[PDB]
Design an enzyme around this catalytic site. Structure first.
Site, PDB file in Angstrom:
ATOM      1  N   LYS A 157      22.037  22.573  32.759  1.00  0.00           N
ATOM      2  CA  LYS A 157      22.256  23.731  32.487  1.00  0.00           C
ATOM      3  C   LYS A 157      23.324  24.440  33.310  1.00  0.00           C
ATOM      4  O   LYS A 157      24.119  25.379  33.132  1.00  0.00           O
ATOM      5  CB  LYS A 157      21.215  24.889  32.597  1.00  0.00           C
ATOM      6  CG  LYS A 157      20.424  24.673  33.927  1.00  0.00           C
ATOM      7  CD  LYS A 157      19.266  25.610  34.097  1.00  0.00           C
ATOM      8  CE  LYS A 157      18.797  25.367  35.368  1.00  0.00           C
ATOM      9  NZ  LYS A 157      18.165  24.029  35.207  1.00  0.00           N
ATOM     10  N   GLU A 183      21.687  28.762  43.653  1.00  0.00           N
ATOM     11  CA  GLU A 183      21.915  27.319  43.634  1.00  0.00           C
ATOM     12  C   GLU A 183      22.602  26.953  44.520  1.00  0.00           C
ATOM     13  O   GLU A 183      22.494  27.462  45.853  1.00  0.00           O
ATOM     14  CB  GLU A 183      23.001  27.656  42.355  1.00  0.00           C
ATOM     15  CG  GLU A 183      22.441  27.175  40.964  1.00  0.00           C
ATOM     16  CD  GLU A 183      21.732  25.757  40.811  1.00  0.00           C
ATOM     17  OE1 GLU A 183      22.421  25.013  40.259  1.00  0.00           O
ATOM     18  OE2 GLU A 183      20.512  25.452  40.980  1.00  0.00           O
ATOM     19  N   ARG A 184      23.135  25.700  44.341  1.00  0.00           N
ATOM     20  CA  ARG A 184      23.401  24.843  45.733  1.00  0.00           C
ATOM     21  C   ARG A 184      24.710  25.275  46.233  1.00  0.00           C
ATOM     22  O   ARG A 184      25.862  25.923  45.617  1.00  0.00           O
ATOM     23  CB  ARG A 184      23.884  23.329  45.544  1.00  0.00           C
ATOM     24  CG  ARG A 184      22.612  22.779  44.576  1.00  0.00           C
ATOM     25  CD  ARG A 184      23.074  21.434  43.994  1.00  0.00           C
ATOM     26  NE  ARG A 184      22.078  20.747  43.240  1.00  0.00           N
ATOM     27  CZ  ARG A 184      21.852  20.869  41.987  1.00  0.00           C
ATOM     28  NH1 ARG A 184      22.471  21.613  41.457  1.00  0.00           N
ATOM     29  NH2 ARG A 184      20.801  20.027  41.557  1.00  0.00           N
TER      30      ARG A 184
HETATM   31  N1  LIG Z   1      27.415  17.143  29.017  1.00  0.00           N
HETATM   32  C1  LIG Z   1      26.688  16.205  29.734  1.00  0.00           C
HETATM   33  N2  LIG Z   1      27.372  14.889  29.634  1.00  0.00           N
HETATM   34  C2  LIG Z   1      26.822  14.035  30.457  1.00  0.00           C
HETATM   35  N3  LIG Z   1      25.672  14.388  31.489  1.00  0.00           N
HETATM   36  C3  LIG Z   1      25.367  15.659  31.734  1.00  0.00           C
HETATM   37  C4  LIG Z   1      26.007  16.536  30.787  1.00  0.00           C
HETATM   38  N4  LIG Z   1      25.298  17.720  31.428  1.00  0.00           N
HETATM   39  C5  LIG Z   1      24.643  17.308  32.331  1.00  0.00           C
HETATM   40  N5  LIG Z   1      24.597  16.186  32.826  1.00  0.00           N
HETATM   41  C6  LIG Z   1      23.769  15.244  33.899  1.00  0.00           C
HETATM   42  O1  LIG Z   1      23.024  16.440  34.578  1.00  0.00           O
HETATM   43  C7  LIG Z   1      23.054  15.988  35.962  1.00  0.00           C
HETATM   44  C8  LIG Z   1      23.120  17.590  36.676  1.00  0.00           C
HETATM   45  O2  LIG Z   1      22.553  18.416  35.894  1.00  0.00           O
HETATM   46  P1  LIG Z   1      22.667  20.249  36.255  1.00  0.00           P
HETATM   47  O3  LIG Z   1      23.788  20.733  35.412  1.00  0.00           O
HETATM   48  O4  LIG Z   1      22.868  20.037  37.838  1.00  0.00           O
HETATM   49  O5  LIG Z   1      21.284  20.664  35.884  1.00  0.00           O
HETATM   50  P2  LIG Z   1      20.255  21.366  37.030  1.00  0.00           P
HETATM   51  O6  LIG Z   1      21.484  22.491  37.637  1.00  0.00           O
HETATM   52  O7  LIG Z   1      19.232  21.982  36.356  1.00  0.00           O
HETATM   53  O8  LIG Z   1      19.932  20.282  37.906  1.00  0.00           O
HETATM   54  C9  LIG Z   1      24.503  15.643  36.079  1.00  0.00           C
HETATM   55  O9  LIG Z   1      24.487  14.554  37.160  1.00  0.00           O
HETATM   56  C10 LIG Z   1      24.838  15.068  34.882  1.00  0.00           C
HETATM   57  O10 LIG Z   1      24.915  13.498  35.039  1.00  0.00           O
HETATM   58 MG   LIG Z   2      22.949  23.234  39.118  1.00  0.00          MG
END
Ligand SMILES: Nc1ncnc2c1ncn2[C@@H]1O[C@H](COP(=O)(O)OP(=O)(O)O)[C@@H](O)[C@H]1O
Ligand SMILES: [Mg+2]
Lengths: 520, 193, 70, 32
Positions: A157, A183-184
């Site tokens: 997300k 967030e981070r």
């Molecule tokens: N469209 C995408 N294609 C490939 N990997 C994805 C995609 N979206 C998210 N990811 C994977 O999700 C990980 C991070 O998710 P993130 O967006 O940080 O969710 P959250 O913030 O809830 O942890 C990334 O390391 C990535 O590898």
């Molecule tokens: Mg995140």
């Protein structure tokens, strides 16, 4: 200065009590602590009844003594808003934390305000095309509405909201405000460098030509700060909507951190806890925030609020309260992210009020409802595929299984921002092209195509192109593999000639640790 | 409506009664009269049993307790402040809070009388040049223009010197702790050197 | 050099009201800070966590079986 | 509050007797 200078009475973590001799401040007003290391801003949350307020501190309370004088500002927490904030990073009290001088402030607006009334509301339904296939197909985003990206702990997300920033936030024309709520800090620095490199943030004297204001209260901040950074991002967006009168964007990251910060604070205010451990005033605090993010008659705030779910639990009350405040909901699931599908949008739980046959057309509506029907009839048979196997189903059911396996791979899409770690270039799909593509797969024009041709492609041309590429390379074969590697004429040197080319680094005498510790 | 501010802030629900009592008796300038009256009531609770039965028994009705505290405190030149205080504290059964409202009142009056206590504990009886040299070194620990008093105690465990007991901070200028910190300072070097 | 530089410092002390369940309700310490490392008489350290209006809550960095009331 | 400032009221500290002398004769018919 005997009156209107109170002293700190008691401190319980991030909750500070100030006791006054006269003229207690109003609730939700800002106090300043005298003689603290950082500028520690308190915020009155209650009146305890012994001439004592109960304050939430916007910074750490480490080092507070119970004799410290606290002055009153006579006002709430007021942030510098205006056109001059475009291109700055702000914390919860309106200070710049990007080290570019002070903030050019047109007006100084407080963060506590009433929501716009019922008669000031606008009732408009126009689509917002984002280029993602699942969003523009099954839950189309309202242009001026509210958007929640549910799903938690590694479903994507935060990647999806960067893709939404990269798609919509440059082709919008209006401003943008990113409010990072817990967030981070690394993600805020990544977005700051990526917005400088893209040109929506400029530095120097041409700062005013930028189109994005950052407000960060990221996850290192104490729970007093994370409970108020969403309100600061709301004040910055509400100056552009209410006074500049033009349509903005407001991407709030992890709005669960607002509810969680208020729950960390409300554990120590001595209130009785509600269900699973949250505060009793969850719904009212979340309403008093989320009803300020609304499109009025004069302007528009198009918000994409990422909502973290705790332990992937949609019956948790902190996202289930948030479900009522959102127009278009985009639930992400980890059971689909473990199937390699990206973005992991759950197609049978992510809804929208824009999915209506009067607004987006009966063709798009009937394609979306047929896609949901095919996926749901697939989901009903999942245990039968699990235990009994694919070799006893009906003909129509093992055709809907193949059609559903093709549209599940087809809903996945490579992103314009995700190619830093995946290699596949991102594909921005238009709206009518993905509607026509899903109409074709629903009617059955692509039954004989392979299923992995649908995986990670943009539109209906590229699935047939990937089928042609992946069904060449099962029949592509070269004779003797055309190496010509040995005996290259004045190309490869000897090994020791290449060794002598290497410059040699010296070793600076065993870590040198005592020489740069007696230096300070 | 216009109450004079207390010199030091305090705690709740028993110190607040003492804060209000000091404020009211400082509006009336009877600040040492009511302290004497509260001391008299402490010893009056110490003397008889039919008065502490009005504060420890939970089966006394509030009507007879209110009428006893009114008809006893009708006379003998009692202050209006102490009379109305004991009426309000006997109407609600708060007569047992007397012993810890008077202590917070004494802390308030000690803040006002601008007099802080101390206690110097010694090994020998102090002579008059030991005492007048003690006051100059102990005054450097107070923080404003006060009236720091010097109490005397004798304890043989110290091998000379003095220890100041301010009831909130302690200055151990004794020799028995000097040799105790001496023998600790040597043994941290013999293990090293 | 240890005797010619030896000033016994004034130290603001406080009594222990109650100890149990990993906390030390410490009377006094009006000059303590929220999160200040306090040190008991038994040598075991502590942190002034909850600065209340009538006491100071102290968690005990170590075994609290060496700490008494007083 | 403490016990140290509360034990020291066990010793008499009135330095006047205009209350404990008169009402000690009035209290017994008042409870009678
Ligand atoms: N469209 C995408 N294609 C490939 N990997 C994805 C995609 N979206 C998210 N990811 C994977 O999700 C990980 C991070 O998710 P993130 O967006 O940080 O969710 P959250 O913030 O809830 O942890 C990334 O390391 C990535 O590898
Ligand atoms: Mg995140």
């Amino acid at each position: 200065p005997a009156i209107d200078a109170g002293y700190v009475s008691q401190v319980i973590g991030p909750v500070v009590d100030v006791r006054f001799d006269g003229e207690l401040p109003s609730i939700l007003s800002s106090l300043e602590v005298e003689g603290h290391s950082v500028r520690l801003v308190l915020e009155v949350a209650q009146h305890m009844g012994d001439n004592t307020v109960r304050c939430i501190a916007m910074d750490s309370t480490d080092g507070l003594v119970r004799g410290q004088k606290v002055v009153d500002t006579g006002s709430p927490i007021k942030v510098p808003v205006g056109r001059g904030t475009l291109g700055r990073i702000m914390n919860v009290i309106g200070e710049p934390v990007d080290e570019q001088g002070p903030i050019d402030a047109a007006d100084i607006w407080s963060i506590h305000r009433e929501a716009p009334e019922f008669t000031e509301q606008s009732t408009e339904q126009e689509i917002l095309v984002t280029g993602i296939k699942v969003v523009d197909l099954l839950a189309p985003y309202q242009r001026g509405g509210k958007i929640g990206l549910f799903g938690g702990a590694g479903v994507g997300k935060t990647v999806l909201i960067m893709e939404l920033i990269n798609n919509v936030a440059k082709a919008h024309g209006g401003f943008s405000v990113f409010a990072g709520v817990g967030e981070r800090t690394r993600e805020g620095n990544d977005l700051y460098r990526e917005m400088i490199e893209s040109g929506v943030i400029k530095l120097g004297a041409e700062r005013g030509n930028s189109k994005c204001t950052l407000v960060y209260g990221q996850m290192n901040e104490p729970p007093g700060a994370r409970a108020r950074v969403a309100l600061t991002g709301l004040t910055v967006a509400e100056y552009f909507r209410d006074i500049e009168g033009q349509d903005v964007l407001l991407f709030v990251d992890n709005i669960f951190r607002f509810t969680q910060a208020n729950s960390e604070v409300s554990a120590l205010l001595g209130r009785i806890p509600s269900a699973v451990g949250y505060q009793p005033t969850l719904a009212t605090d979340l309403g008093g925030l989320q009803e300020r993010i609304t499109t009025t008659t004069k302007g528009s705030i198009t918000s994409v609020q990422a909502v973290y779910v705790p332990a992937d639990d949609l019956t948790d009350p902190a996202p289930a309260t948030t479900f009522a405040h959102l127009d278009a909901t985009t639930v992400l699931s980890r059971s689909i992210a473990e199937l390699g599908i990206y973005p992991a949008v759950d197609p049978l739980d992510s809804t929208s009020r824009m999915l209506n046959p009067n607004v987006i057309g009966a063709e798009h509506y009937n394609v979306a409802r047929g896609v949901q029907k095919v996926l749901q009839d697939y989901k009903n048979l999942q245990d039968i595929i699990a235990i009994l196997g694919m070799d006893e189903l009906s003909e129509e059911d093992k055709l809907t299984v193949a059609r559903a396996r093709k549209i599940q791979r087809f809903l996945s899409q490579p992103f314009q921002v995700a190619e830093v770690f995946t290699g596949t270039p991102g594909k921005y799909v238009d709206l009518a092209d993905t509607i026509s593509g899903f109409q074709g797969v629903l009617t059955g024009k692509y039954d004989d195509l392979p299923e992995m041709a649908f995986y990670m492609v943009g539109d209906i041309k590229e699935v047939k192109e990937k089928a042609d590429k992946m069904a060449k390379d099962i029949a592509s074969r070269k004779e003797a593999d055309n190496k010509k590697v040995s005996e290259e004429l004045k190309d490869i040197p000897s090994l020791d000639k290449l060794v002598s080319e290497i410059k040699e680094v010296v070793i600076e005498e065993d870590d040198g640790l005592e020489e740069d510790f007696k230096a300070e | 409506l216009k109450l004079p501010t207390a010199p030091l802030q305090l705690s709740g629900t028993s110190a607040q009664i003492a804060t209000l009592l000091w404020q009211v008796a400082a509006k009336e300038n009877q600040l040492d009269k009511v302290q004497d009256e509260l001391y008299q009531f402490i010893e009056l609770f110490k003397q008889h049993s039919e008065l502490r039965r009005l504060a420890t028994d939970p089966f006394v009705p509030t009507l007879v307790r209110t009428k006893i505290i009114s008809s006893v405190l009708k006379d003998s030149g009692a202050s209006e402040i102490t009379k109305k205080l004991f009426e309000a504290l006997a109407d609600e059964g708060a007569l047992s809070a007397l012993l810890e409202v008077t202590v917070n009142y004494e802390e308030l009056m000690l803040a006002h009388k601008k007099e802080v206590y101390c206690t110097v504990i010694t090994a020998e009886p102090l002579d008059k040049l030991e005492r007048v040299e003690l006051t100059k070194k102990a005054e450097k620990f107070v923080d404003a223009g006060f009236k720091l008093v010097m109490q005397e105690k004798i304890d043989k465990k110290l091998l000379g010197g003095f220890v100041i007991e301010f009831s909130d901070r302690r200055v151990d200028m004794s020799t028995a702790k000097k040799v105790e910190e001496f023998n600790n300072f040597v043994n941290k070097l013999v293990l090293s050197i | 050099e240890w005797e010619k530089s030896y000033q016994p410092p004034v130290i603001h002390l406080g009594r222990v009201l109650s100890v149990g369940d990993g906390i030390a309700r410490v009377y006094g310490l009006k000059s303590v800070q929220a999160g200040e490392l306090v040190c008991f008489d038994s040598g075991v350290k502590g942190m002034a966590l909850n600065l209340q209006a009538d006491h100071v809550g102290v968690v005990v960095f170590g075994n609290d079986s060496v700490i008494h009331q007083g | 509050a403490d016990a140290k400032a509360l034990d020291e009221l066990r010793k008499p500290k009135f330095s006047s007797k205009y209350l404990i002398q008169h009402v000690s004769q009035k209290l017994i018919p008042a409870v009678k």
